[PDB]
Amino acid sequence: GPLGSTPVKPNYALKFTLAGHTKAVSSVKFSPNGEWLASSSADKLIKIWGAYDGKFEKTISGHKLGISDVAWSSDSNLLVSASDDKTLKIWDVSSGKCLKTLKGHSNYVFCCNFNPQSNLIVSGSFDESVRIWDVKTGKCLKTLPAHSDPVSAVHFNRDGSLIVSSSYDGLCRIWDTASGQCLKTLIDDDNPPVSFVKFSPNGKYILAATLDNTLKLWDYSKGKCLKTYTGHKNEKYCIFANFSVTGGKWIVSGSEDNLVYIWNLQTKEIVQKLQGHTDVVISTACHPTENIIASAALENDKTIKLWKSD
Amino acid sequence: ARTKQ
């Protein structure tokens, strides 16, 4: 919009606060077609909300325990969610009904994701494994003995040929989806738990979060750390982190000081901090085409806020 | 749950 596309700093501003979840919100995700927003919560439910007006839409349910993650498919037609009931469920966002219940993990399922071709589901559990599922057959294709502690994040690259995973075991791993073979391990000489990780939108980099109030940008081919983003508080929870591109080029993340941080990807300088939540901001999301950010707070707050910028 | 430490 009106400010650059390479502005000095953006001016995100609160436009809506969504309320409905009776417990702590875990994550929020904008549909690929940018029309919706889905949120998972400790209250065992998933909620859909209009991306631009914030208006409540529907409540998809079925999980027996808490849901720590929820993700969309490319066609914006399905959702997958990681629950403490030890399962993952495929959902028809249209009918709100549960299509498949992926059974296999022996502990909580902490994270999940579809591949671009939406025929596969990657999952991360407490049991320290990473599983690849078949969306149609609802069966498990592989059980990667990925880490030696709980797995905090799982993500596919542009063509779903690679899977990146994180764990409290202080490790970041890249997997070959086809063979399930461990291709690379991003390591550190301190080994702080890795709370989050994700491929960049061009696939050349990995954005990772460690519980030492730090965010890192990695060149995975080279296995080198290019950027280090700091200034916030993250030592206890697994806060998702995003790549903002629609307007400027930022790295966005929730925080434990109840704020939302926005950093310049190149300079690593904080450019803006969104104030409004009254408890840790565990999840943020960046709108696919418009400068819209979606933040979600913990039980102490229980809301979701939508911020728009120029 | 992601909402618990």
mmCIF file of C-alpha atoms in Angstrom:
data_model
loop_
_atom_site.group_PDB
_atom_site.id
_atom_site.type_symbol
_atom_site.label_atom_id
_atom_site.label_comp_id
_atom_site.label_asym_id
_atom_site.label_seq_id
_atom_site.Cartn_x
_atom_site.Cartn_y
_atom_site.Cartn_z
ATOM 1 C CA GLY A 1 0.000 0.000 0.000
ATOM 2 C CA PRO A 2 0.837 3.784 0.468
ATOM 3 C CA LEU A 3 4.176 3.292 2.287
ATOM 4 C CA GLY A 4 7.062 1.914 0.283
ATOM 5 C CA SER A 5 7.462 -1.840 -0.216
ATOM 6 C CA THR A 6 10.856 -1.016 1.246
ATOM 7 C CA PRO A 7 9.629 1.546 3.862
ATOM 8 C CA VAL A 8 11.767 2.637 6.797
ATOM 9 C CA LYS A 9 9.250 1.253 9.303
ATOM 10 C CA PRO A 10 5.627 0.149 8.883
ATOM 11 C CA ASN A 11 2.622 1.415 10.884
ATOM 12 C CA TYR A 12 0.653 -1.687 11.788
ATOM 13 C CA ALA A 13 -2.448 -0.755 13.745
ATOM 14 C CA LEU A 14 -5.120 -2.688 15.576
ATOM 15 C CA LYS A 15 -8.314 -3.184 13.586
ATOM 16 C CA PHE A 16 -9.985 -6.118 15.338
ATOM 17 C CA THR A 17 -9.866 -8.294 18.436
ATOM 18 C CA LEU A 18 -11.505 -11.703 18.116
ATOM 19 C CA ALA A 19 -12.909 -13.562 21.094
ATOM 20 C CA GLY A 20 -14.509 -16.962 21.455
ATOM 21 C CA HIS A 21 -11.919 -19.433 22.557
ATOM 22 C CA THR A 22 -12.503 -20.240 26.209
ATOM 23 C CA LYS A 23 -8.834 -21.048 26.709
ATOM 24 C CA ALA A 24 -5.318 -20.189 25.514
ATOM 25 C CA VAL A 25 -4.934 -19.805 21.773
ATOM 26 C CA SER A 26 -2.097 -21.909 20.345
ATOM 27 C CA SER A 27 -1.819 -20.836 16.722
ATOM 28 C CA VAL A 28 -3.408 -18.837 13.944
ATOM 29 C CA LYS A 29 -3.133 -19.342 10.192
ATOM 30 C CA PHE A 30 -4.473 -17.368 7.247
ATOM 31 C CA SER A 31 -5.960 -19.517 4.449
ATOM 32 C CA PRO A 32 -3.816 -19.518 1.288
ATOM 33 C CA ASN A 33 -6.578 -17.690 -0.601
ATOM 34 C CA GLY A 34 -6.494 -15.018 2.105
ATOM 35 C CA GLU A 35 -10.211 -15.196 2.921
ATOM 36 C CA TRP A 36 -10.040 -16.874 6.322
ATOM 37 C CA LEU A 37 -8.141 -17.251 9.557
ATOM 38 C CA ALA A 38 -8.110 -20.449 11.557
ATOM 39 C CA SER A 39 -7.191 -20.696 15.228
ATOM 40 C CA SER A 40 -6.501 -23.699 17.445
ATOM 41 C CA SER A 41 -6.843 -23.559 21.223
ATOM 42 C CA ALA A 42 -6.352 -25.442 24.481
ATOM 43 C CA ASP A 43 -10.150 -25.467 24.591
ATOM 44 C CA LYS A 44 -10.029 -28.384 22.093
ATOM 45 C CA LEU A 45 -11.519 -26.250 19.296
ATOM 46 C CA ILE A 46 -10.729 -24.663 15.955
ATOM 47 C CA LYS A 47 -12.376 -21.451 14.827
ATOM 48 C CA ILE A 48 -12.643 -19.800 11.426
ATOM 49 C CA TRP A 49 -12.784 -16.010 11.057
ATOM 50 C CA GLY A 50 -13.009 -13.665 8.101
ATOM 51 C CA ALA A 51 -9.528 -12.446 7.258
ATOM 52 C CA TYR A 52 -10.509 -8.823 6.603
ATOM 53 C CA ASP A 53 -13.500 -8.078 8.869
ATOM 54 C CA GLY A 54 -12.555 -10.378 11.741
ATOM 55 C CA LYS A 55 -16.099 -11.780 11.784
ATOM 56 C CA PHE A 56 -16.543 -15.186 13.441
ATOM 57 C CA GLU A 57 -17.469 -17.938 10.981
ATOM 58 C CA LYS A 58 -17.655 -21.463 12.398
ATOM 59 C CA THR A 59 -16.369 -23.769 15.141
ATOM 60 C CA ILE A 60 -14.830 -27.040 13.918
ATOM 61 C CA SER A 61 -14.481 -29.602 16.740
ATOM 62 C CA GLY A 62 -13.770 -33.229 17.592
ATOM 63 C CA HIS A 63 -10.432 -33.413 19.376
ATOM 64 C CA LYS A 64 -10.457 -35.040 22.815
ATOM 65 C CA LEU A 65 -7.713 -32.885 24.323
ATOM 66 C CA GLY A 66 -5.825 -29.714 23.456
ATOM 67 C CA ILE A 67 -4.777 -28.691 19.949
ATOM 68 C CA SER A 68 -1.251 -27.231 19.724
ATOM 69 C CA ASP A 69 -1.254 -26.562 15.981
ATOM 70 C CA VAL A 70 -3.484 -26.179 12.922
ATOM 71 C CA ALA A 71 -2.492 -25.748 9.256
ATOM 72 C CA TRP A 72 -4.123 -25.202 5.836
ATOM 73 C CA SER A 73 -3.696 -27.053 2.527
ATOM 74 C CA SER A 74 -2.890 -25.150 -0.694
ATOM 75 C CA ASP A 75 -6.437 -25.093 -2.062
ATOM 76 C CA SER A 76 -7.501 -23.600 1.259
ATOM 77 C CA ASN A 77 -9.939 -26.544 1.445
ATOM 78 C CA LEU A 78 -8.499 -28.596 4.298
ATOM 79 C CA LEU A 79 -7.011 -28.252 7.755
ATOM 80 C CA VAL A 80 -4.804 -30.521 9.785
ATOM 81 C CA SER A 81 -4.380 -30.207 13.549
ATOM 82 C CA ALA A 82 -2.011 -31.552 16.211
ATOM 83 C CA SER A 83 -3.695 -32.515 19.479
ATOM 84 C CA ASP A 84 -2.697 -33.753 22.934
ATOM 85 C CA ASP A 85 -5.072 -36.652 22.403
ATOM 86 C CA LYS A 86 -2.072 -38.094 20.550
ATOM 87 C CA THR A 87 -3.656 -37.599 17.135
ATOM 88 C CA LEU A 88 -3.884 -35.424 14.065
ATOM 89 C CA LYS A 89 -7.151 -34.820 12.262
ATOM 90 C CA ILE A 90 -7.869 -33.868 8.666
ATOM 91 C CA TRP A 91 -10.759 -31.394 8.364
ATOM 92 C CA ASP A 92 -13.061 -30.320 5.572
ATOM 93 C CA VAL A 93 -13.152 -26.581 6.273
ATOM 94 C CA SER A 94 -16.263 -26.438 4.132
ATOM 95 C CA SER A 95 -18.360 -28.968 6.062
ATOM 96 C CA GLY A 96 -16.511 -28.531 9.360
ATOM 97 C CA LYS A 97 -16.563 -32.330 9.536
ATOM 98 C CA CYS A 98 -13.621 -34.594 10.344
ATOM 99 C CA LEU A 99 -12.406 -36.567 7.325
ATOM 100 C CA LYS A 100 -9.502 -38.505 8.860
ATOM 101 C CA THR A 101 -7.968 -39.104 12.308
ATOM 102 C CA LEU A 102 -4.255 -39.857 11.961
ATOM 103 C CA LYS A 103 -3.221 -42.339 14.676
ATOM 104 C CA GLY A 104 0.400 -43.295 15.331
ATOM 105 C CA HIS A 105 2.227 -40.970 17.733
ATOM 106 C CA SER A 106 2.582 -42.170 21.315
ATOM 107 C CA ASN A 107 2.551 -38.742 22.928
ATOM 108 C CA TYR A 108 1.253 -35.238 22.227
ATOM 109 C CA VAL A 109 1.367 -34.071 18.601
ATOM 110 C CA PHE A 110 2.929 -30.623 18.792
ATOM 111 C CA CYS A 111 3.140 -29.482 15.176
ATOM 112 C CA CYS A 112 1.806 -30.345 11.698
ATOM 113 C CA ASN A 113 1.833 -29.172 8.047
ATOM 114 C CA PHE A 114 0.671 -30.100 4.531
ATOM 115 C CA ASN A 115 3.169 -30.260 1.663
ATOM 116 C CA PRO A 116 2.452 -27.892 -1.242
ATOM 117 C CA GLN A 117 0.817 -30.671 -3.279
ATOM 118 C CA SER A 118 -1.395 -31.309 -0.235
ATOM 119 C CA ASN A 119 -1.142 -35.096 -0.574
ATOM 120 C CA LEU A 120 1.122 -35.391 2.444
ATOM 121 C CA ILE A 121 1.076 -34.328 6.092
ATOM 122 C CA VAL A 122 4.236 -33.892 8.160
ATOM 123 C CA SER A 123 3.824 -34.101 11.926
ATOM 124 C CA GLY A 124 5.970 -33.476 14.967
ATOM 125 C CA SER A 125 5.304 -35.110 18.313
ATOM 126 C CA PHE A 126 6.496 -35.250 21.913
ATOM 127 C CA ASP A 127 7.600 -38.825 21.228
ATOM 128 C CA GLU A 128 10.467 -37.225 19.303
ATOM 129 C CA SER A 129 9.572 -38.647 15.926
ATOM 130 C CA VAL A 130 8.525 -36.954 12.712
ATOM 131 C CA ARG A 131 5.819 -38.704 10.697
ATOM 132 C CA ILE A 132 4.809 -38.293 7.058
ATOM 133 C CA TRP A 133 1.170 -39.062 6.336
ATOM 134 C CA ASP A 134 -0.963 -39.810 3.302
ATOM 135 C CA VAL A 135 -3.847 -37.335 3.249
ATOM 136 C CA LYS A 136 -6.120 -39.611 1.152
ATOM 137 C CA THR A 137 -5.472 -42.967 2.829
ATOM 138 C CA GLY A 138 -5.018 -41.394 6.256
ATOM 139 C CA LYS A 139 -2.182 -43.855 6.786
ATOM 140 C CA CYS A 140 1.352 -43.140 7.969
ATOM 141 C CA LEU A 141 4.067 -43.404 5.286
ATOM 142 C CA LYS A 142 7.180 -42.999 7.470
ATOM 143 C CA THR A 143 8.353 -42.643 11.048
ATOM 144 C CA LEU A 144 11.583 -40.679 11.074
ATOM 145 C CA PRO A 145 13.457 -41.125 14.348
ATOM 146 C CA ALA A 146 14.125 -37.380 13.959
ATOM 147 C CA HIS A 147 15.273 -36.233 17.395
ATOM 148 C CA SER A 148 15.968 -37.191 21.007
ATOM 149 C CA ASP A 149 13.540 -34.792 22.651
ATOM 150 C CA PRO A 150 10.156 -33.409 21.645
ATOM 151 C CA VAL A 151 9.841 -32.069 18.078
ATOM 152 C CA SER A 152 8.627 -28.433 18.047
ATOM 153 C CA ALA A 153 8.163 -27.809 14.299
ATOM 154 C CA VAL A 154 7.782 -29.478 10.869
ATOM 155 C CA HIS A 155 7.745 -27.721 7.488
ATOM 156 C CA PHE A 156 7.961 -28.569 3.735
ATOM 157 C CA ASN A 157 9.796 -26.478 1.098
ATOM 158 C CA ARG A 158 8.191 -24.940 -2.062
ATOM 159 C CA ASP A 159 7.999 -28.319 -3.783
ATOM 160 C CA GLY A 160 7.609 -30.543 -0.768
ATOM 161 C CA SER A 161 10.830 -32.350 -1.549
ATOM 162 C CA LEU A 162 12.360 -31.419 1.826
ATOM 163 C CA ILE A 163 11.170 -31.363 5.435
ATOM 164 C CA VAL A 164 12.741 -29.175 8.103
ATOM 165 C CA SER A 165 12.275 -30.014 11.768
ATOM 166 C CA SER A 166 13.174 -28.521 15.152
ATOM 167 C CA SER A 167 13.463 -29.943 18.655
ATOM 168 C CA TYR A 168 14.240 -29.162 22.301
ATOM 169 C CA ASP A 169 17.213 -31.393 21.601
ATOM 170 C CA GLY A 170 18.781 -28.165 20.275
ATOM 171 C CA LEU A 171 18.787 -29.475 16.718
ATOM 172 C CA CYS A 172 17.454 -28.450 13.309
ATOM 173 C CA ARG A 173 17.091 -31.119 10.647
ATOM 174 C CA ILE A 174 16.419 -31.356 6.930
ATOM 175 C CA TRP A 175 14.851 -34.529 5.592
ATOM 176 C CA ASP A 176 14.429 -35.925 2.111
ATOM 177 C CA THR A 177 10.668 -36.543 1.938
ATOM 178 C CA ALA A 178 11.107 -39.343 -0.597
ATOM 179 C CA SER A 179 13.718 -41.431 1.263
ATOM 180 C CA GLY A 180 13.187 -40.086 4.751
ATOM 181 C CA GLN A 181 16.968 -39.783 4.999
ATOM 182 C CA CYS A 182 18.474 -37.062 7.238
ATOM 183 C CA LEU A 183 20.186 -34.671 4.815
ATOM 184 C CA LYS A 184 21.513 -31.972 7.090
ATOM 185 C CA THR A 185 21.810 -30.947 10.727
ATOM 186 C CA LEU A 186 21.964 -27.298 11.778
ATOM 187 C CA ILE A 187 23.835 -27.188 15.068
ATOM 188 C CA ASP A 188 25.067 -24.714 17.736
ATOM 189 C CA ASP A 189 27.876 -24.793 20.358
ATOM 190 C CA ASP A 190 25.359 -24.023 23.134
ATOM 191 C CA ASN A 191 22.445 -26.141 21.946
ATOM 192 C CA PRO A 192 19.525 -24.098 23.269
ATOM 193 C CA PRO A 193 16.199 -25.839 22.614
ATOM 194 C CA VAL A 194 14.871 -25.069 19.154
ATOM 195 C CA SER A 195 11.268 -23.920 19.589
ATOM 196 C CA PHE A 196 10.520 -23.030 15.955
ATOM 197 C CA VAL A 197 11.737 -23.468 12.383
ATOM 198 C CA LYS A 198 10.416 -22.842 8.869
ATOM 199 C CA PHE A 199 11.660 -22.647 5.280
ATOM 200 C CA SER A 200 11.789 -19.193 3.675
ATOM 201 C CA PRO A 201 9.398 -18.545 0.768
ATOM 202 C CA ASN A 202 12.112 -19.235 -1.807
ATOM 203 C CA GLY A 203 13.435 -22.315 -0.006
ATOM 204 C CA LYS A 204 17.022 -21.137 0.332
ATOM 205 C CA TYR A 205 16.798 -20.263 4.008
ATOM 206 C CA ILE A 206 15.489 -21.578 7.308
ATOM 207 C CA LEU A 207 14.076 -19.282 9.989
ATOM 208 C CA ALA A 208 14.623 -20.798 13.412
ATOM 209 C CA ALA A 209 13.674 -19.882 16.968
ATOM 210 C CA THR A 210 15.657 -20.887 20.089
ATOM 211 C CA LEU A 211 14.573 -20.502 23.691
ATOM 212 C CA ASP A 212 17.327 -17.989 24.393
ATOM 213 C CA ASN A 213 15.293 -15.012 23.173
ATOM 214 C CA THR A 214 16.744 -15.435 19.686
ATOM 215 C CA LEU A 215 15.630 -15.865 16.084
ATOM 216 C CA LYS A 216 17.992 -17.043 13.364
ATOM 217 C CA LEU A 217 18.079 -16.940 9.574
ATOM 218 C CA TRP A 218 20.021 -19.880 8.123
ATOM 219 C CA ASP A 219 21.393 -20.614 4.643
ATOM 220 C CA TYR A 220 20.761 -24.346 4.799
ATOM 221 C CA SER A 221 22.691 -25.372 1.715
ATOM 222 C CA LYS A 222 25.786 -23.864 3.334
ATOM 223 C CA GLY A 223 24.605 -24.609 6.845
ATOM 224 C CA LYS A 224 25.537 -21.118 7.990
ATOM 225 C CA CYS A 225 23.722 -18.591 10.169
ATOM 226 C CA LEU A 226 23.144 -15.376 8.182
ATOM 227 C CA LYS A 227 21.046 -13.265 10.538
ATOM 228 C CA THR A 228 20.346 -13.083 14.246
ATOM 229 C CA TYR A 229 17.214 -11.245 15.419
ATOM 230 C CA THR A 230 16.886 -10.236 19.061
ATOM 231 C CA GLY A 231 15.333 -7.848 21.530
ATOM 232 C CA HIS A 232 12.328 -9.910 22.560
ATOM 233 C CA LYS A 233 11.462 -12.465 25.215
ATOM 234 C CA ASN A 234 11.272 -16.169 24.375
ATOM 235 C CA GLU A 235 12.536 -18.710 26.883
ATOM 236 C CA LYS A 236 9.429 -20.728 27.681
ATOM 237 C CA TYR A 237 7.024 -21.202 24.770
ATOM 238 C CA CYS A 238 7.124 -22.188 21.143
ATOM 239 C CA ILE A 239 6.293 -18.926 19.396
ATOM 240 C CA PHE A 240 5.826 -19.212 15.599
ATOM 241 C CA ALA A 241 7.815 -16.691 13.554
ATOM 242 C CA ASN A 242 6.882 -15.333 10.092
ATOM 243 C CA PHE A 243 8.320 -13.839 6.895
ATOM 244 C CA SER A 244 6.499 -10.665 5.884
ATOM 245 C CA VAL A 245 6.686 -9.782 2.187
ATOM 246 C CA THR A 246 3.478 -8.073 0.965
ATOM 247 C CA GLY A 247 4.650 -4.663 2.149
ATOM 248 C CA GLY A 248 8.244 -4.487 3.331
ATOM 249 C CA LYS A 249 10.435 -7.516 4.088
ATOM 250 C CA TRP A 250 10.121 -8.312 7.770
ATOM 251 C CA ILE A 251 10.511 -11.193 10.201
ATOM 252 C CA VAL A 252 7.543 -11.216 12.562
ATOM 253 C CA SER A 253 7.116 -12.919 15.908
ATOM 254 C CA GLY A 254 5.055 -12.981 19.055
ATOM 255 C CA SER A 255 6.815 -12.547 22.389
ATOM 256 C CA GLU A 256 6.581 -13.265 26.099
ATOM 257 C CA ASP A 257 6.360 -9.612 27.059
ATOM 258 C CA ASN A 258 2.880 -9.583 25.447
ATOM 259 C CA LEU A 259 4.085 -7.705 22.378
ATOM 260 C CA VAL A 260 4.482 -8.508 18.691
ATOM 261 C CA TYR A 261 7.860 -7.729 17.184
ATOM 262 C CA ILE A 262 8.570 -6.799 13.569
ATOM 263 C CA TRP A 263 12.193 -6.749 12.368
ATOM 264 C CA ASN A 264 13.861 -5.616 9.153
ATOM 265 C CA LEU A 265 15.058 -8.852 7.531
ATOM 266 C CA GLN A 266 18.307 -7.335 6.246
ATOM 267 C CA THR A 267 19.281 -4.981 9.101
ATOM 268 C CA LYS A 268 17.934 -7.096 11.941
ATOM 269 C CA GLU A 269 16.687 -3.874 13.515
ATOM 270 C CA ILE A 270 13.280 -3.941 15.194
ATOM 271 C CA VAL A 271 11.001 -1.685 13.157
ATOM 272 C CA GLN A 272 7.790 -2.013 15.151
ATOM 273 C CA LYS A 273 6.289 -3.589 18.294
ATOM 274 C CA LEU A 274 2.539 -4.168 18.422
ATOM 275 C CA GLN A 275 1.023 -3.461 21.841
ATOM 276 C CA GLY A 276 -2.402 -4.727 22.853
ATOM 277 C CA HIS A 277 -2.281 -8.254 24.252
ATOM 278 C CA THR A 278 -2.283 -8.841 27.981
ATOM 279 C CA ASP A 279 -0.376 -12.118 27.941
ATOM 280 C CA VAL A 280 2.324 -13.902 25.931
ATOM 281 C CA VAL A 281 1.781 -13.737 22.174
ATOM 282 C CA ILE A 282 2.267 -17.373 21.172
ATOM 283 C CA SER A 283 1.324 -17.139 17.512
ATOM 284 C CA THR A 284 1.439 -14.577 14.712
ATOM 285 C CA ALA A 285 0.602 -14.942 11.044
ATOM 286 C CA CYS A 286 1.121 -12.729 8.028
ATOM 287 C CA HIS A 287 -1.654 -12.268 5.452
ATOM 288 C CA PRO A 288 -0.812 -13.777 2.015
ATOM 289 C CA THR A 289 -1.562 -10.643 -0.053
ATOM 290 C CA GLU A 290 -2.444 -7.685 2.205
ATOM 291 C CA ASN A 291 -0.397 -6.257 5.070
ATOM 292 C CA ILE A 292 -2.382 -8.005 7.811
ATOM 293 C CA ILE A 293 -0.853 -9.694 10.868
ATOM 294 C CA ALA A 294 -2.761 -12.076 13.170
ATOM 295 C CA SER A 295 -1.559 -12.519 16.762
ATOM 296 C CA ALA A 296 -2.917 -14.892 19.405
ATOM 297 C CA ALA A 297 -2.364 -14.804 23.176
ATOM 298 C CA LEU A 298 -2.331 -17.336 26.042
ATOM 299 C CA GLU A 299 -5.086 -18.254 28.612
ATOM 300 C CA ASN A 300 -4.403 -15.111 30.564
ATOM 301 C CA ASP A 301 -5.603 -13.121 27.531
ATOM 302 C CA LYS A 302 -7.462 -15.581 25.228
ATOM 303 C CA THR A 303 -7.871 -13.278 22.212
ATOM 304 C CA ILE A 304 -6.772 -12.833 18.617
ATOM 305 C CA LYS A 305 -5.975 -9.406 17.182
ATOM 306 C CA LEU A 306 -5.744 -8.301 13.551
ATOM 307 C CA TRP A 307 -3.396 -5.475 12.645
ATOM 308 C CA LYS A 308 -3.361 -3.703 9.251
ATOM 309 C CA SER A 309 -0.579 -1.550 7.826
ATOM 310 C CA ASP A 310 0.115 0.604 4.798
ATOM 311 C CA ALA B 1 -0.027 -28.442 24.532
ATOM 312 C CA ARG B 2 1.943 -25.553 23.025
ATOM 313 C CA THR B 3 0.168 -23.392 25.598
ATOM 314 C CA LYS B 4 1.928 -25.047 28.563
ATOM 315 C CA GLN B 5 5.622 -24.700 29.555
#
